[PDB]
């Protein structure tokens, strides 16, 4: 199975991410909350990045790839 | 919107904004 | 999705067309505003036979109920405003409760008290969808239903649930 | 943005505060209220 | 951060004078930072869509030709506004909620909006249309002559198209090792273990073959001339059977091929 | 005048397919040498392939087989996939003949002269029970693709794929400059016959072009560029 | 032209867009036009007309003098680079030589958008009506880079800036070159008074006129007052309010007007000095600019391609502009296709070359239209102009380019060669010359 | 069925400015893509001499008139664009033009410095009268293609200097056509003729060789 190699913002696919949360809006908060987390760590919630980050990756993009790999929960209140 | 609050819809709903995000105990270890 | 704001999506789904509407925007506003129809059309108040009488270039429709009880008569109706089609209504035909007796627009308030709330929403969605479909626009019924739902939310003695 | 920090939580739009004053000028007493029912100084 | 400027006031002076050092920097900050595009009047939500910015020359905004349908944007002095989402939540909502390639179907009828239109329609129509009596036409000659209308593969047919031997819109028969047959033919012609990577010969125009190379390898062979309605059928069908990214990229390929053959 | 820093890189898709890039190029050199490269790859390289064939039992009857599974048309296009590098420089007749139920392949044919078949596992036909097959093959080197060229009865001229490159496609992107307006970037995608590898085919193409453009260089050769 | 062939919608648009054109530096007249081209220019008043029959005495870029039969001299001073009310260039240029003899009412100098007496609101460009790789799509347009190199669609634009020095309550504003806190380099283009020198360049944010106003009470910052004591720069008593160039605007300084209170200039009460700087700029036709023809067809410039890769005739003559095909049929402005055919006829010339007599189509054609050399101008009044039969016949009469080869067939198409790949375009493509406006 | 014959170079002279070329024999399909691959390089990369900036003593910018002359300055600049100039000097050289009195100022009145030459003296530059006197120096540089006027800001140029668009294109007009031999399925060959025209700066043989030599350099393994 192959769709193709995605470019930039379209990676990772939204479909593979939606399997990790309930709705698209939940997914938004997920990456957002984690994005602030990573940035706080760069200028010391302080954890990660769990995945090997390519240089200059926007912490939002890092948080998305984290959710792709099931690396974080992910509890809804 | 008038007072500048989050609209009670989409990402403004309570169940979505109060989410807590932490790495799994398994994930933090692997680093 | 859970958070979807379908009310706005519906208002825009219905709002984007209308630049394509040219039997148009006036009729659409008349329906959503629930005004008395521009040219009012009668609906059957009860099911039964229909006796079609022709006055001096007038139309006089009487309904002999199947009870059979008190006849239901419609006194004066312009002959220039044609009758509904099943062909066109004729003497002796059978009519059900909510049927449209003549071509035109049924008073949404009248169909309300006759058929009840559940049907008013169906009548309005049909009439509205008839306009947009006549101009060629494709809109899903649920958007109109979202709007129409907001019209029957209250009851005269106030919101329903409250 | 210059310090590269997270972006802060927004405040009260000045337009809204101006709206409250414009209502007061019309002899309309508008009060922002919390759960307690206590008035809140808009300043 | 880099030692180009010692303090902020030097950086601000640098940018205002358009110092050449800032250009390569701008690419780094713009990378994967979405921007919102909008055209007035805003009739539906698809009137605002997020995109990935690309530093381009000139003072005009380059807009993807597919989103023209959603924006109702014709290129006659038409202007559009740009908005920069700042907060992490704002960028997340842009990349997730308002991304261009995630909003294909009109949220009124479910029909596809990024579906190809005027120029690309005629291009694909000409590409898949079938011409009687075209160059390279297959006749399946019988008496003292072989068929002489078949080709070893779509690649050989291309070499025949570059020479004056073949026409793109000719009825021909070739065997495809990387495409999937239709449902009826896949069932009977193929032992029901699978039907990938196995040679099978069907008779269609070379154009229709190159056309089906744009659709996913997993999609059946269509073998029709692409009226605009037929294109809506396939994209509607693709939304059901495939994720959005598959649809987004496929319509991108349909754009490149539609335009190419639109000029030809 | 002299400009700087054009390069050539290759990403291998498979043992038969290789992708190449040129970075960077001055506008608009992408389209200039782009279509010329692909055209050179297609119809310039010398290669050996089948020209005509004749099979015993094939006659006035249009196309049917006395003892195999697929019609003669299907076998023709099967044979068109035969890759054979030859050193004869002229038409040479190969010999293939098999009997008994089984599957015939490329290995079932003896290489007469300068011939080394490069795809022995290639299928040709599945033989009927107690089936025999007798057929000749005319192989001559050549360039590119020549359609079936049509004294002899039962002689079937076939479309001949001389070149080792089956398909080459190209497109030009634009990126990689600081203040410039998106210098050209060339992408070429070539699928190889296994007779030669892609980069040798590209190297041969370049050698053919440079020798072809030295035609104009040898005229004056004084005015030049990088 | 061909007004009778266009719907009132696009015709209404075409009429509105003629008054939207801008004066080009070249100001070439329309190859295919109507009668009104001449009279509209002279009656507009932007053209220099001789009111007495005479002979020219002197011809200068500044002025021109003409001696009449009366012996009385008339002289006309030329507007050279006058800024219009909307920023367009009102330059005038003489069309007569020294010893030429003129008649009363004749044209002596061309206006901004006139040539030889008739309005020239645009240029004549080689057009191809094929769709081209989507770069011309949904009314967009692609052009030859020639239009940049050869300044054909280049148009000069001037802007007027203004700053005044008045008497404030705290003190009098002074136009001066001394600015509180600035490098000497930002002043390097200013003169003594503090105004930008003539012929100097201007980049957005640069200084045109240095002006200063009193400031008090200072009450500076404790953090700032220390830096003043360290580096010894006295905190100046006045605030910097200088006239700078607006963002994105650029060009060169043409002239400066200065009205001063010291000299007995008339000023409004409280205003001492007034200085106005006039900046002009050359505008190469650029991506995103809006072009249009006389038939209500309009579109932005989507891309400008190098002359090398452009659909070109077998001559090697590249087309200047490529117009999408899909926008032509639906809008009922097909009159633009007619002037495209006539446009090629006019630039190529023709000779009916009657076998025996005027072929049956030319029954109504005037004899003067039978022959015509290359580059001839044509006039087709709106409701009695050229008609279809005459056009095809004129399309059948054409002339070789240089060699015997003919470049456009009887239905007005030509086999174009793709400049990118090199292989020709499969189908004959309609080419011609269309008059388009910036 | 390889046919072995070295691709030949035949040259023809159609005129003084342009001269035809023909190449044969070539494989089928090469005629069009190869001729255009030369054409694109001819128009874009042929090096030449072009006037970069010019100066007129009386004027400080290009938007003023000169007393006695019939053309305004920016009109003179547009007339100066047509100049076809050849400069063997690698570095920037400054020509001069001084003329006065009634008459016509052609391109020939320009005095070239050591090593450069003007190839179209007949060009009308300006027309002067009794009161008109014209002094102008022109800076000639070497390059290729079309470079827009370099603003005097990017350089340390004087306020009197007038930058001008520069067109280094010795080639005027170029095309091609193919005579293709597709006989009775025997020895199909391609014959391609190119029609190269120059501006008299360099002869077509020399420009084609320059482009051809440049093409050779880019094609590499
Ligand atoms: N804040 C939302 C919460 C709704 C929900 O998540 O259930 C309301 O009000
Ligand atoms: Mg528009």
Short mmCIF file of C-alpha atoms and ligand atoms in Angstrom, two decimals, chain B residues 13-15 17, ligand 1:
data_model
loop_
_atom_site.label_atom_id
_atom_site.label_comp_id
_atom_site.label_asym_id
_atom_site.label_seq_id
_atom_site.Cartn_x
_atom_site.Cartn_y
_atom_site.Cartn_z
CA UNK B 13 -15.63 23.13 23.88
CA UNK B 14 -14.71 22.19 27.45
CA UNK B 15 -14.02 18.51 26.73
CA UNK B 17 -9.63 22.56 25.90
N1 LIG I 1 -17.53 24.04 27.28
C1 LIG I 1 -18.40 23.16 26.51
C2 LIG I 1 -18.22 21.71 26.95
C3 LIG I 1 -19.14 20.72 26.25
C4 LIG I 1 -18.64 19.29 26.32
O1 LIG I 1 -17.45 19.06 26.03
O2 LIG I 1 -19.43 18.38 26.67
C5 LIG I 1 -19.86 23.60 26.67
O3 LIG I 1 -20.14 24.66 27.23
#
